[PDB]
């Protein structure tokens, strides 16, 4: 089975840089295509027959290669180029897994906000503690929960957004779900964000016994 692999799976660069991404085949093939995808929309033809640009594709893009190795190249990258690029060829069942190009920008620390479980959820017998970490960069960030002074790892679910289309920041939710009875057994809840913008964490907390 002729198979495609793509490298790197993820890269990031400031606008103005040169960008290159590789698509490899298990055995020699020809006439490689490349498709661009952005969140919520269909894949779009970008490069075809190894070197031809689809309509509406700026001449900063170029495709090349032969044999078992091909590549897509962008000169003087612009923010709109951010997307996932997938290679594919006429004898291939599975598309390559794609390179995701993201926009590099200045580091930013997160705006952190903590929300105690709603009385309505508590009425139902569930208790979700929600902590938002918004408008930060880079994407790699670490969140820690402490309950009455001890770290907790079970019952946490974290969800990042796609890189923001206007300012290239990331946001993420971190949610601690507990049963109502387990929530009622503790008092101090703390959400900490540790980022490479500072060695000292950002910290938000509350006591359940208040309000």
């Amino acid at each position: 089975d002729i198979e495609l692999t793509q490298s790197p799976a993820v890269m990031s660069a400031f606008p103005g840089e040169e960008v290159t991404m590789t698509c490899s085949a298990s055995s020699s093939i020809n006439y490689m295509h490349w498709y661009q995808q952005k969140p919520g929309t269909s894949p779009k033809r970008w490069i075809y027959d190894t070197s031809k640009l689809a309509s509406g594709v700026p001449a900063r893009f170029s495709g090349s290669g032969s044999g078992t190795s091909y590549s897509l190249t962008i000169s003087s990258m612009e923010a709109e180029d951010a997307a996932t690029y997938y290679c594919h060829q006429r004898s291939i069942f599975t598309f390559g897994s794609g390179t995701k190009l993201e926009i590099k920008r200045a580091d930013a620390a997160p705006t952190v906000s903590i929300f105690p479980p709603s009385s309505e959820q508590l009425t139902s017998g569930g208790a979700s503690v929600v902590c938002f970490l918004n408008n930060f960069y880079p994407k790699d960030i670490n969140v820690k929960w402490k309950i009455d002074g001890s770290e907790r790892q079970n019952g946490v679910l974290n969800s990042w957004t796609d890189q923001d289309s206007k300012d290239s920041t990331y946001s993420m939710s971190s949610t601690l779900t507990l049963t109502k009875d387990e929530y009622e057994r503790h008092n101090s809840y703390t959400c900490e964000a540790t980022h490479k913008t500072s060695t000292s964490p950002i910290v938000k907390s509350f006591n359940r016994n208040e309000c």
């Binding site: 089975d1 075809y48 709603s118 946001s171």
Partner: protein, 221 residues
């Protein structure tokens, strides 16, 4: 000009069947080879089936193993894909695509139609206001939220004050929790404007035909 419009997707139990349609416009549909491509939840893209312009040449992807049947009706400018004995691995977004020349790039794609294979049943979501309460804030800005828990299938759409609060919104991607979806949405407004000016989240779940509004009220301590 050129348009491809898919339909017929939905929820389906394992072992069942489903027929997907792709309506075409803007070109001489009978002159072009057509294909179906599917994208899995892992974003993997797989070539499912191909059919020549005349309906007399057909190919299938490696895992299809006879359970898929591609066909077309050039008189009604429509392409179909018949699915049978569906499995959990067949869950994906299914796309209708058109071919340009005989190196088989796909020069136009449809909007996609989603197929979900599981035993889960449609379930409306619960919606919970997120006021600060015991975690009161003190800056020029305040951040509020809504928790949306326990729905199936995806998606829900979230808005704030009917989309009049657009700036300062983050609606996080959903995650499966007890095999039901959950997400939260946050909004940031000047603290001088709340609670004096009302803030409401608008949750819509088309598949259950539910629409709920949760006013964000300050907690009664």
């Amino acid at each position: 000009e050129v348009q491809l419009v898919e339909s017929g997707g939905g929820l389906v139990k394992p072992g069942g069947s489903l027929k997907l349609s792709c309506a075409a416009s803007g070109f001489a549909f009978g002159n072009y080879d057509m294909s179906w491509v599917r994208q899995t939840p892992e974003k993997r893209l797989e070539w499912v089936a191909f059919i020549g312009s005349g309906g007399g040449r057909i190919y299938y992807g490696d895992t299809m193993k006879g359970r898929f049947t591609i066909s077309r009706d050039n008189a009604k400018n429509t392409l179909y894909l018949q699915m049978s004995s569906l499995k959990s691995e067949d869950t994906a977004m299914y796309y209708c695509t058109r071919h340009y020349n005989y190196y088989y790039s796909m020069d136009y794609w449809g909007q996609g139609t989603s197929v979900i294979v599981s035993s889960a049943k449609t379930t409306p979501p619960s919606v919970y206001p997120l006021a600060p309460g015991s975690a009161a804030q003190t800056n020029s800005m305040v951040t509020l939220g809504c928790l949306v828990k326990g729905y199936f299938p995806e998606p829900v759409t979230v808005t704030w004050n009917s989309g009049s609060l657009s700036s300062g919104v983050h609606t996080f991607p959903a995650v499966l929790q007890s095999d039901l979806y959950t997400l939260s949405s946050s909004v940031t407004v000047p603290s001088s404007t709340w609670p004096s000016e009302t803030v409401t989240c608008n949750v819509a779940h088309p598949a259950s035909s539910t629409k709920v509004d949760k006013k964000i009220v300050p907690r009664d301590c």
